[PDB]
Amino acid sequence: NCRKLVASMPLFANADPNFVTAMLTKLKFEVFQPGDYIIREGTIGKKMYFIQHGVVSVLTKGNKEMKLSDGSYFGEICLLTRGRRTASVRADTYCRLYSLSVDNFNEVLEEYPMMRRAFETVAIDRLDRIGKKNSILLH
């Protein structure tokens, strides 16, 4: 199972190894082909999606056209959000992706109340924190 792949997420760097693992029991796998839009919004409560093997060509709405690569994650829906969100991204290649519904991550958070409060803070504290790294984006 996806032990390292959910742990590849930049928020999970600091996670409890039981919380990250209890999430894996109901995960789903899906593939896309080159040029195909993997994520666009239109309704409330959309999922998380994360890259098992492949590349995406991607937009951040504040920012640039990018690529993103394997081990990465996307879909900017906060678990505590209200309403629909904005992102726009497509498969660069024949890409192997994985997904979990947001509400079932909200279910497993309640088994680990230390991690649950660590989400009740970022639910407002994140506003000016925009995507910054601790030191560098190097292995």
For residue 90, give the 3-state DSSP assignment. Answer: strand
Q: Token pair for residue 14?
A: 């600091």
Cα R_g (the chain), whole angstroms? 15
Burial of 120 from C-beta contacts in 10 A (0-12 / 13-18 / 19+): exposed
What span, in angstroms and rounded, lies between the C-alpha atoms of 61 and 109? 29
Structural domain boundaries, residue 39: 1-139
- Give the chain's domain count: 1
Q: Which residues are annotated as a binding site?
A: 66, 75-78, 85-86, 126
Helix axis angle, 113-125 to 102-109, nearest 10° = 130
DSSP character at residue 61 = T
Nearest alpha-carbon partner for 102 in 44, 41, 42, 52: 44
Q: What CATH code is carried by the domain that includes residue 34?
A: 2.60.120.10
The pair phi, psi for residue 54, each rounded to 5°, is: 145, -170
Residues flagged as binding site for 3',5'-cyclic AMP: 66, 75-78, 85-86, 126
Rounded Cα distance between 26 and 99, Å, is 10
CA separation for the pair 28, 98 (Å, rounded):
6
Distance CA(139)–CA(129), nearest Å, equals 22
